[model samples]
Target chain A: GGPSVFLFPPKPKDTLMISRTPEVTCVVVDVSHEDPEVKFNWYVDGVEVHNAKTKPREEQYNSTYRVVSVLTVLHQDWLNGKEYKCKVSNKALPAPIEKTISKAKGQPREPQVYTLPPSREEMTKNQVSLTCLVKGFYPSDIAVEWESNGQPENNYKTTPPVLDSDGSFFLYSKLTVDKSRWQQGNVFSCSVMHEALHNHYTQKSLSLS
Target chain B: SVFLFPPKPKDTLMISRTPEVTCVVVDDPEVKFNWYVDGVEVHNAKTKPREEQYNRVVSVLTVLHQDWLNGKEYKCKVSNKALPAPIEKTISKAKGQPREPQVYTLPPSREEMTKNQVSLTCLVKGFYPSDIAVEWESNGQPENNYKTTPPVLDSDGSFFLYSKLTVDKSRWQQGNVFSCSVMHEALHNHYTQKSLSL
Candidate 1:
């Protein structure tokens, strides 16, 4: 087949970006030849990044080489909607290849959150349960936290999100509290954190006399 | 003293039991009821007037059917001295007639049997015409300590009724067979009955 052309140029692969609170990591993969001199670089808004690192190159089935580079950025820069670029170069390649990643511009659906008190039949000797229902949201990643009288509460359990009939997601978190404390008029609040909301958190509160 | 008949008395009447049409009237002041079939007076029908709670009187009229295909109009006429005119209501067969009932009999729980009185529950659902009877029997004898609730209209135009019978704990501990019998217009020739024991 016309002497079986051996392509030795570096070609950029798909970009992988993950955004967790404290930091965001961007990974770029390149498919190239077995040349040991392949170089990877990272840039944010045209400024060169210094904290970039590269992983060991691996051999592919097609007699090609797979190269990976990762770049770490402060989460605030990602939240500020900055663009990132990953570039790879090799002496066997004619030119450098680049891949870019930016914040998603599509609109997200906000979640509906509500809190419910324990029913009369669910009461026990010294403890009762409260529930928080989070429903009808797109992009299912969310965090549910409970609070008692403005203090953070850790005595709760949350279930994984489940898809509903209408293509939405729903989940519930249940918290247990002292019966006497609830009866003494202590306020219980459930706060939901979702990326879609204008404010990051939505809170619902309940109190009994 | 006035006597009520068929010789055998049923708390409710169904077309299947005897093909009877029932008319009920609450007495504003001890009302009188008269039954008519197609403008002719019906003297053979039975009527019962009873004193109910709150010192009020309720009169019931029962007219047996000699023919179901005749489509005769049976009208009940009520009158009292306090009213200048009589109140008349005509009874006609519904297009959707004879929907049978589902009967369920539940015996007393072990914890409930430990109390002084134990209760047995009967649930009757999905019946038409609302003309149904729930009768309770313990050890093959009629039990009078039972109360049947009024019929509740269902979503699909049927009716549901619940009856609860209470007996002394001694009777339940003796392993009596408690039975619930349901008589509805849809059940022809025989009524539906459920029995529970132990």
Candidate 2:
């Protein structure tokens, strides 16, 4: 027994893999080492996601792959049954390594409440002044209108509302009529309208007492 | 949109500009009219439109300066209202011969006064249409030694005139020379000059 020949098993190659976040399911390719210099790439269906770089190494059921500096999950579009792919490559590599992932469904946030001020009204042959105030809304787009006993009349003047720094609205109108007619107790109202609502939210009415 | 009202005689007026006297109607519904110089109404001179109704209006009375000296008052009377108020303005020429150029004499020199307060009064006489300016001068240099207050004109445009000059009394006491001069149109450039030394 001067010399003895020994044989050894080959070591496994480096691989590119993709896993789902929050669920940590291995939705993409399991192992791939096509080229040593090949970079890792991910895709949703046929679209490429250049940001998916790492695979979860932990044995935990849903290992979320996180970015190094940002510390956020590596995959944003990870979902069940949605197609995803990743590829890896470098200059010295002949073919790139890639993987794919399935898609995930998402829902948007809810709508918030918006408040508008009262409507304005004025009677014939009387002097009237009306003001409207509105607040509590994002992207403000409001409108105001005047009516006499339910009919639109152009015999009056309306002023455009002023916008406040805290995002509120204000408007005013002045109407002058014969003194005798105003003393007779005329009805007036002010209304505020907005696109978010089907109809005016506030209505204010006044009469000369 | 103008309506022509009936031509009222009271709205008619006569105006004269020498060698071309005219009768003008100052009323709104103006009449194409003529003018009378003295008493004769001469026709076919010239007539033009008048803008105002009857309230505020002006018409010129003119005559040759040669004919104007004949001692007559040129009158402009305009008629326009139904019961027209004959409005008239009269320009009268003074009578008599052309007067002589008035002589203005300077006041007595106040050599004893201080240089800053030396006051002198000059009197003018004989000038007609008496608008005149009396001036003071020193050593022929009108600007150097003479400082005058404003000249005063008489109300009648005739007769007596006066002017006051205050010299630097300190300068006058130092024996400065001063003279007073009078200028007027009617006097045929007549000027009275007098010099004083303190």
Candidate 3:
């Protein structure tokens, strides 16, 4: 034989939230192998799901085959936190390999947002700082931005998300501007982007009225 | 019946950035404790419940500093089988005393110096509340080619940050003074500056 056949276990599914209020959840998993004859089975608990779609194996530059499988389910079930499993079987392997994801272990959480104005001491320094705190979110992935009167403001500072003992994450974004603009009642807004929000952004606004 | 003692209504819970929340209970020998943030239970919260006096049991809930700063409502629920319902005490973000940062400047190192440019670093440490500003100036003129890091939390309940200014080699050889200016709420003068020259 020129080369021995190889089989790799399926990777963790790349998950996505497609909607809200019982939104659709999508999980995509990939399996790499040297043999084209492979099978992927999706399961929720012991019950098998037949809605999963498997793509034909694509040949790679290294002569390996990359096969993809996708499964979609209701977000309510995901939030209720069920274990979803993907089993990959190949001719080269004696037994099928499996990977699982569940909310029972580490469930996702939606973030809470808070906005604060500069302290009294900072107001006396001819400038003010506005802060936005995004707290208690899971997965540790988020983006923050600042805007002044509807215009994007680049001069802002954002901290990396810090994880809490409860497996959630928190982060902050601060924007400094002259007191004149703040006193003039310029509207400052902080927008938080997260995977859970999916096409939606959480925003908080502050201004001296 | 368990009596849950709440702190003073107007008293700020955090002074100098304490990372723990306490709930004092009296007259309950077998009181159970639960901690929640915004109505959601904290499954991983580090809780310490101990009897300090003959009838007083104090429960302490330790949380991340950032979680405390998020300003969400925290509730300490205490219960006993004798009581009909659980007694709860709630707390939120509190005012705290801010600490000023100490600033130090470092001239460009051999590793940071290249054929075309050189860099200077300003290190700021030991600040509380995490909001501050750093600016760079060259010969009293504001310089825009400066990079600043976000304030990172320190173990002692404070923060530290850094700002670096990169300048052309020719400008560095011309003996142009580079200044790092800091603005913080806790500073006595609300401003601090350090200069590096030649």
Candidate 4:
């Protein structure tokens, strides 16, 4: 028999790149190489963030400026106006690849706001009721509370808000005060915590007047 | 509860070869000892002391083949009986090439030579099956070239392939690139491509 003939392909070169979305304003750092066995890393702002060691998948997306292995960050508060960094590295190579985005933010539209229902004045012993309505928000994070004569009460009740298929959400809460408490000038208020607005806390108050 | 200690083997067996094989029975007075080979046993070979005729504390089996070329199974069985069980391991021959052929020198070191004088030889040693293909390319393109003959295998199963090109020296001197590539399957068809400028 004769000696067999064989040829091996040349080793491939390594390449890297960084990208970002226009509306969201985030940086996407990409690290790749011709050698499938080559390992590498991605870094952010002098901090080791993402790489082959932490995320073996080699690909990641920063929708909410959160560092995730294989899942997307669904929290609305983390989506907008947050700085993020990513770092990637592999054992095959000596150094690592790092990238950073100074001001990465989520660009969700502003949520709509609705007025609370009118407050009731006169009441007997237990015939006082109060309701408040809010709109133009998605993913409700609001709470309602009631107080009587400066003392906290148990009239804090919430109702599931309506949501639109267009990524908008609506919700409301109601409070019923005993007529005796109402005559004594009970104070009730509703506050909303919007996750999209960086967890902006808002409150609406009402009196017997 | 009380336990008895197993007796040790009287003699050891030796395998005759460049790399010899030896076996012995180990007895631990404090702790129980169990031996296994590929997770199996050899007849009454699994026991402590001299429970059976071959239950000696130590037994040595010698391999009679040169370098132990013949592939065979050899294992020693040991057990404390109460602990787990006896075990055995299979010993096999080593399969690997001693060395590979490498390029040391090339022919035609000077330029301005005539066509008959323009020749190159690929020096290789420590390989088998001299049927190697030596290809020539000009200016990165494959050109028609020929070799003197197939490589001749040495006594050590090593071989070398040499090729020569009788092209016009003037044409080669006019800025041409000559390359020699060796193809073989024993090493996964790995080819060494070297280029020379004239």
Per-residue lDDT over A1-209 for candidate 2, one digit per residue giving the tens place of the 0 to 100 score: 11111111111010111331332222222222331222344455676544533544323233322211101123333312345443434444345534333322332111122111111222331333232222323223344445558865343343343333334433333332344544566565555544333332445554454
> Counting only residues 3 or more apart in sequence or on different chains, how many pairs clash (N, Cα, C under 3 Å) in candidate 2?
61
lDDT of 3 by residue, B23-140 (tens): 7766524767888988989865454556466426667666554465556777888878776788887877545677888776756544334447665666676687676778899768
List, residue by residue over A103-161, the lDDT tens digit for candidate 1.
55444568877565665534544666666666667656577889987899776666666
- Chain A TM-score (model 1): 0.57
Residue B91 lDDT, candidate 4, scale 0-100: 52
| Candidate 3 lDDT, A43-121, residue by residue in tens | 8876898887677767768666666676665654654566677777776666777777655346567776666666444
For model 4, how does the per-residue alpha-carbon lDDT over B140-172 read when each residue is reduced to its tens digit?
777664443345544445664334444556556
> RMSD to native for every prediction?
28.8, 42.8, 20.8, 36.1
Task: State the weakest 10-residue window (summed lDDT) of model 4 chain A.
Answer: A9-18
CA lDDT scores, all candidates in order: 0.62, 0.37, 0.64, 0.39
Off by over 4 Å in 3: A1-34, A104-112, A117-130, A136-160, A165-168, A174-184, A191-203, B1-198
Per-residue C-alpha lDDT of model 1 across residues B1-198, encoded as one tens digit per residue: 112222112423444444455555542356677777788886765655555664344344454543332346777777777766887877555446667786656555433445576666665666876766789986678988776666766545777665667778887778878999887657764387888667
Q: Per-prediction fnat values? A: 0.00, 0.00, 0.12, 0.00
Question: Whose TM-score is greatest here?
Answer: 3
Runs off by more than 4 Å, candidate 4: A1-127, A139-152, A195-199, B1-198
- For all candidates, state DockQ relative to the true structure: 0.01, 0.00, 0.06, 0.00
lDDT of 1 at A84: 76
Top candidate, metric DockQ: 3
| Candidate with the greatest lDDT versus the true structure | 3
